[PDB]
UniProtKB/TrEMBL annotation:
Protein name, as recorded: LbCas12a
Lineage: Bacteria, Bacillati, Bacillota, Clostridia, Lachnospirales
Site entry (Binds DNA protospacer adjacent motif (PAM)), positions: K532
Species of the source: Lachnospiraceae bacterium
Positions annotated as active site in the UniProt record: H753 (for pre-crrna processing), K762 (for pre-crrna processing), K779 (for pre-crrna processing), D826 (for dnase activity of ruvc domain), E919 (for dnase activity of ruvc domain), D1168 (for dnase activity of ruvc domain)
Site (described: Binds crRNA alone and in crRNA-target DNA heteroduplex): T16
Coiled coil: 77-107
Site annotation Binds Target strand DNA: residues: K585, K595, G734
Domain Cas12a REC2 intervals: 290-506
Cas12a PI domain sequence ranges: 581-672
Region (Binds crRNA): 510-514, 701-704, 713-714, 775-783
Amino acid sequence: MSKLEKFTNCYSLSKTLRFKAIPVGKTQENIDNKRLLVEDEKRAEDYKGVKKLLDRYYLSFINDVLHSIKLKNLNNYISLFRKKTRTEKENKELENLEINLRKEIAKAFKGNEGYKSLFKKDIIETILPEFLDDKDEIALVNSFNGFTTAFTGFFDNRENMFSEEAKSTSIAFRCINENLTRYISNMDIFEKVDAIFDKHEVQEIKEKILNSDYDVEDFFEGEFFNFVLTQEGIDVYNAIIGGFVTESGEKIKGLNEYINLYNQKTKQKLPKFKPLYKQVLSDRGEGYTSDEEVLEVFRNTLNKNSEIFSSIKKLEKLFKNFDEYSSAGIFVKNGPAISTISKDIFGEWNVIRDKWNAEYDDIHLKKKAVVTEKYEDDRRKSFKKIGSFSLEQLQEYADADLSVVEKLKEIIIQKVDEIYKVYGSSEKLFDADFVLEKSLKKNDAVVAIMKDLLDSVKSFENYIKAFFGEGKETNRDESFYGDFVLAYDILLKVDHIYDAIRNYVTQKPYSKDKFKLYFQNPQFMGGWDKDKETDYRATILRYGSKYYLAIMDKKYAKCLQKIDKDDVNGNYEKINYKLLPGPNKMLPKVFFSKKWMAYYNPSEDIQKIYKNGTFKKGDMFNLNDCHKLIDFFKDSISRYPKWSNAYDFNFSETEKYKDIAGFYREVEEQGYKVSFESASKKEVDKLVEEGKLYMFQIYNKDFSDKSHGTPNLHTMYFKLLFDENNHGQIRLSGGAELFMRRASLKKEELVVHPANSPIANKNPDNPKKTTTLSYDVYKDKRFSEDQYELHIPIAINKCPKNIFKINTEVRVLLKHDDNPYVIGIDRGERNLLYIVVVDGKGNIVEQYSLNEIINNFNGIRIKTDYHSLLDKKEKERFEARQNWTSIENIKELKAGYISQVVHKICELVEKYDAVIALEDLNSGFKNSRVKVEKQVYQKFEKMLIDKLNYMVDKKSNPCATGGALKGYQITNKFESFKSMSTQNGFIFYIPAWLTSKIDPSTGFVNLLKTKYTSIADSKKFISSFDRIMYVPEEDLFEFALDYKNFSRTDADYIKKWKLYSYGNRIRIFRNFDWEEVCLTSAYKELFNKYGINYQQGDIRALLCEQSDKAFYSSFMALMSLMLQMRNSITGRTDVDFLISPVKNSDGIFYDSRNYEAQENAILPKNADANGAYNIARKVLWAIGQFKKAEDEKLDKVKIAISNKEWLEYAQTSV
RNA sequence: AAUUUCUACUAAGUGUAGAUCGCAUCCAGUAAAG
DNA sequence: CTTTACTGGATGCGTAAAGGACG
DNA sequence: CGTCCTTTATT
Ligand SMILES: [Li+]
Ligand SMILES: [Li+]
Ligand SMILES: [Li+]
C-alpha cells in the first residue's frame, strides 16, 4: 500500500558492530601473568616492519617484470586512439584492445616463475630470507615462521595489484587506463608546441635530465611508452615536463616552464603537459613519536650550546657593528613585508613607498598631464618591480637627523635582547634535572614557554630575512652578507622544529591507537562454526541477557568440548553455529577433493561438464547437463554427514531450476543455523579461574543494569542475531576481531564534576537549571583505562528475494501514485540546509530551516543551533593553531549534525511516502565559511544514501515493515560510482538553474542583459519594449515587454510580461558597501534630472531622444535593479527577501517577507526556501513524464529538466 | 557532563536521544612552510 | 618542489574444510 | 598420528 512497503529484502549489505569487552574474574590477571598482551603489542609493530620488508621484494618483482615488457600492438592502439572520427565498430574494436593491452600486463606478471609463492608462506619462509642481507631484517621475518596465515589479508591487497581488471588498485589499470591516455594526450600537445622549443633547450634537457642517452622527442614517440611503465621511467618523464634539480643546485627548466614563459612573452594560449601518475608500491622531516623526544630535541636544538643559538650570538655581533659596513652595500628587499620595516624605521607604514613615489615623480613628471589614472597606475607598476632598497636609498628618505642605519640596529638589538629574556623564563626546561610533571599535550604551562621561545626566535629571523634583499645585486658588501647568510641559513633550521613540535603538542590528549589480539592463534576468531571452535579457540556464551566471548588458551583448546547440565538456571549456553559459506565454492571444493572424489565417483559426463562449464550462462550453456550436475550435488550432500545433518535440506525438484544459481541460492539460504546448548556454569567458571579459558562480557551501555529507554540501533542488531524471530534477515558473520586499546589519559588529569556539588544544565528552556548527583562525573573517562574492543561483522539480507532494478521500481510506483510527495533539500550560505515538502500538486506542506535541530523527548523541547556551533568550533580551530592548544575536532561536529539531519529526513520520508530532491553541487567554493558548508552538504549526501541502504525505525516491532529485521532499501548499494545516474533510488539529483532567482508565484525569470555597453545598443533595448509608461493610480512605472523582441529568450514560455517599479531593491558598492534603492523614486529622479516628461503616455521615443550617455548608463543600471529579484547582504543574516517586478493573476506583487512572517505559508518564505521548493518542483515535473510513459518504457524517461521545459512548467502550473 | 564510537545532552541518577561498516591496501588530490 | 598531516574515493576480506608438515 | 598451521573452492 505505501511505495516504501515494496523496498524490503532487496539486496544484501554488511555491517560491523563494535563493543567493549570486559574481562571476567581472574582472566585479566591470568592474561597479565602469561604476558599475552605485551606479546601481541610487539607482534603488531613487527608486523608493520615485515610488510614493508615484503613490499621491498614486491617492488623489485614489479620493476624488473615491467622493464621486461614490450607491449604488442601498443602502437596500433595508439593509432586508433587518436583518430578524430571513429565508427561504433571501431569504438569497440579499440576498447577490446584496451582489455588485451591490460591482459598482456597481467599475463606478464602471472607468467613469471615466482608469482606462485608471492602470497603463500614461502615468501616469508624462503624467498625473503634469501632476498634480504641484514641479519636483523632476516631475524624479523623469521619470527613469523609459525604465523604466515596472519598475512592473508595483506596478500589479497597485493594480488589486486596484479589484476587485469579496470580497478583503481590494479597495475595494469594504472599503466593503460590512466598513464597511457595521459601520454597520448601529451603526445598531442608536444607536436603542436614543438616549434617553441629552442635547439639549445632540448639539448640542455637531454644532457642533464636524460644523461644524453635519449632524445627529448623520444619520450613523445608512440613506441617509447614501454619505457615509462616502470617508475624509474616515470620519474625521468615528469622531470622533462616539470624540470628537476641536479645536485649542484642548478635548476633545470622543464618544457612546461618554457611553455609558461612563452605564454607570457607571447600572451598566447598554450596548453602545458600533464604529469604522469605514480606506479603502485614505489616509495617516493617526519613527525615525533615520544613525549621526552620532544623535550630532548627541543633542548638539543635550542639550548645555549646549540648551533641555532650560536648564530643568534653571531647575528648579534654583525648588527652591533652595523655602522661599519657600506650603506651602498646592504639591501632591504621590497615585499609585502616592506611597510612593517617602514613603520619600524620611520613610524608610518606608508612613508617608504610615499617617498619613493615622490622621487619617481621628479624624473618622470611634467605638469601638462597633471596626473592621470594610469600614470599613477604606471607608478604603482614600477614600485612592485623595484626589487630592493639600499641602506642609502633609505637614509636619503630619512629626514634629518634620524640615522636609519643606527635605528635599524636599535630595532634588531631590541629583538635579540628579548630573545635572551625568553631564555631566562625557559632555563629550567633546559637542565637535564627537569622532569615532565604532566603529559605534554595536557601540560599547557611548559608548552607555552617552548612556544614563547620558538616564537621570539622565529619572529627574529623572519624580520632579518628582508636584509637578504633579493641579491642578485651587483655590489653587495660581502663582508657583511658572508657571516649573515651562514647564520641565517642555520637559524632557518628552527622552522622544521617549530612545525614538528606544534603538530605533536596540539594533538588530541586521548588516543585511539590499538593493536590486534591473536592469543597465539594466527587465525584467531576466524569463524564461528561449531566444527572449528577449537581451531579458532573462540566462541560466544550467554547467561540470560548478558553475552560473553570465551577464548580458549592455546594449552587447553578442547576445554569447552565436554560440558553439560540439564538446567540452564545458573548455567551458560554454548552457541551452536553452523555455516555453509558460499556454495559455489564449497560444493566443488569438497566433492572434487582428492579426499572425496574417489568416494563419490562422478560420471565422466559430470567432470566433462564441470570442466567445460556447460552449467553456467553463456553460449556453451546446456540446461540438461546443468540439471545433472545439480543432481550430482544433491546426492553427495546427502552422503556428506557434516552437512546433511546440520541443515535438513528441502530442495526444489531439480527440474524446476533454470540455472545453477537457483540451486545454490537454496543451499546458501538453508546452510545457516544458530542455536544454544546448555553448558555448566560451575565447570566454565573454574576454567576461567585456572587460566584455561578467558571470558569477556560483550558490552555497551545498553547492557548496564541502570539502562532504561531505547537501545542503540546496533544493540538491536546484535540481540536480534540470536532471536528466534530472525529467520536469516541478519546473520552473524565470521572475521570478528578483538583489539586492545591502552589508556591515553589518567583520571587524575581528567576534568571532573565532583559528587554532590550541583552541575549546571545547558538547555535554557529546561526549568531544572541544575543537576546534582551522588558520584563523580568525568570527561573522557572511557580513555582513562585500558579497553578491549570487539568488532563483529554482520550480514543483512544475505538471501534477498525482492530482486528488481530499484530505480525502475521507483518510477513505476511513482507513475501510479495519485499524490506523490517530494522532499526538496537545499543549501544556502545563510542556511546549512533548507527543506520544503510538497504534495503531488506542488502544494507547500512544510518548509523550514535545518540550521537548528529540534528535539522533544520527556516533554523537554531543546533546540540546538548547529549553525552557530559549526562557526564557533570553526573559530576555535584558528585560535588553537596560534595559541598552540589542542585541535578542536570539527570533522565530527559535522557528523554529529548530519546524524540529526538524517534521522529527520528519514522520518519525513516515512511520514509522507516521499521521494527526495537534492541539489546538484558546484565544483568551486567561494568563501571559507562557504566551503565548510559545501563539505557539510557533501557529507550529508554520503550518510543519507547510506542510511537509505537499510533504513530502520527503532520504534517499530522488529519484524514489521520498517523494523530492524525488515529495513527499507530505497537507495542502491554503492555510495557513489559507477552505477550513478540522475536518480539513486528515492533520491533524484536536480540542477539548480533558476530555482532561486525565479518568482514562484508567476514563474517569471530575468532573461534580459542590462549591462550598459553603448549608447547605440541602449536605444534598441528601450525600443524593443512594447511600451514604457507611468501609472499614477499606483505610483509605478510599467515596462511592457515581449521577450520575443530580445535575444536568447527561447527558454521563456509566456513571451509577454509587464514589469513594474515596485518596492525596493538593494545595490552593491562598486568600491556599508550596500545602499538600498527605491525604484520608483529613482526613475523619477533620472527622468527629472535629464528633462524627460515621464507622465506622457508611451515614453520610449523620448528616452532615445537623449544623447547624454550619463542618462543611458543610469537608466540601464536602474533596469538591472528592478529585475534583481533576490536582494541581500552577505554577512548580515537578516535580509534574504525575494521580490518580483511582475504582477500575478490577482494583481499583487510577490514578497518573500509577506510569507516569512506567517507560520503556515503557502509560498516560499525566502530565496533559500524558494530554491528547495523549486528543486522539488522539477522532480514533480519528472514524475509527470513518468505518468506519460508506458511502464515498459519508464527506465528510459529523461528526468533532466530542460531550462525551456522548466520555465513552461513553472509558468503554467500556477 | 558519563558512551563500542560520535554529536547534543543530564527530571530525580553510573545514565537520555539520535546516529554509527570494520579491518587492510592502493591512490589521488587539497591546505601550509623552506 | 621537498618535506608532512589532515580528508576524499577505490580495491579486498568478513570461511569451513581440504591439504600438509611435524615433532 | 594427533595437533596445529596453510591453502583451497569460486553462482
Ligand atoms: Li539509549
Ligand atoms: Li562541561
Ligand atoms: Li534519565
